[PDB]
Design a protein around this ligand. Structure first.
Ligand SMILES: NS(=O)(=O)c1ccc(Cl)s1
Ligand code: NA
Ligand code: NA
Ligand SMILES: [Zn+2]
Length: 258
């Protein structure tokens, strides 16, 4: 037994090994757009990715991670709701078996085909491992994907997936520019939450962009050819690797835009 996204190990089972799954600040949530309040004290988001150094791409049996050098302030997120500098460590996606599902956050109950998470840690805590012991340790930039026209800046990711088909495979992945994954607008919603995979730690300031990016049907079809299993094991397609919306509890979602 190990956690996953199947009938016997999926989100309804996670609380048995990770009791915080039933906690007070779990993610994702539904973003009810009429209940979210504009906050004039929020700042524009500052995304500084010009000096990013990607290193490697890894199939971890749950998703694929594109990893970055986080030993200096090379790719950072400031401003917005944040009171510090947050360094990019990795990005990954969640996606569906069908175009009508796959996102973790929803917007007025609408599901997108996929969701991109750019994961950053607060530099005042020194390393990612210490940051995930803190209530303000992480900031995750979430971006919705809809199916339509292709996203050119995603294609290098699509094309390497053949070399990391199965759990545990990694490949060199240098000189990837994450600026190619952003929409035009940086307008956002924000709320306090958690990692959406075990260990489900309640360390995250979520920043979810209002504008989706559009990717082609062929791009998301290639995500769906990945495998949850290892090489030489029975093939189980890596699809529907999303957690559903969780109770909002005593939280307020704020909007950067009126
Ligand atoms: N899915 S997420 O909350 O971005 C996340 C899961 C594990 C991480 Cl490390 S970051
Ligand atoms: Na509100
Ligand atoms: Na270094
Ligand atoms: Zn995620």
């Amino acid at each position: 037994h190990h956690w996953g996204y199947g009938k016997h190990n999926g989100p309804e089972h996670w609380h048995k090994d990770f009791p915080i799954a039933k906690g007070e600040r779990q993610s994702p949530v539904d973003i009810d757009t009429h209940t979210a309040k504009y906050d004039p004290s929020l700042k524009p988001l500052s995304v500084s990715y010009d000096q990013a150094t990607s290193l490697r791409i890894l199939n971890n049996g749950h998703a694929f991670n594109v990893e970055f050098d986080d030993s200096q302030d090379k790719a950072v997120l400031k401003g917005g709701p944040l009171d510090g500098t947050y360094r990019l460590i990795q990005f990954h996606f969640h996606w569906g078996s069908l175009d009508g599902q796959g996102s973790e956050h929803t917007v007025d109950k609408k599901k997108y085909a996929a969701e991109l998470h750019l994961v950053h840690w607060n530099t005042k805590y020194g390393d990612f491992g210490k940051a995930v012991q803190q209530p303000d340790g992480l900031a995750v930039l979430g971006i919705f994907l809809k199916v339509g026209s292709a996203k050119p800046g995603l294609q290098k990711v699509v094309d390497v997936l053949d070399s990391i088909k199965t759990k545990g495979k990694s490949a060199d992945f240098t000189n990837f520019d994450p600026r190619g994954l952003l929409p035009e607008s940086l307008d956002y919603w924000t709320y306090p939450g958690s990692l959406t995979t075990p260990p489900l730690l309640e360390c995250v300031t979520w920043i979810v962009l209002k504008e989706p990016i559009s990717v082609s049907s062929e791009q998301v079809l290639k995500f769906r050819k990945l495998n949850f299993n290892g090489e030489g094991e029975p093939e189980e397609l890596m699809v529907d690797n999303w957690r559903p919306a969780q109770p909002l509890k005593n939280r307020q979602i704020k909007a950067s835009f009126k």
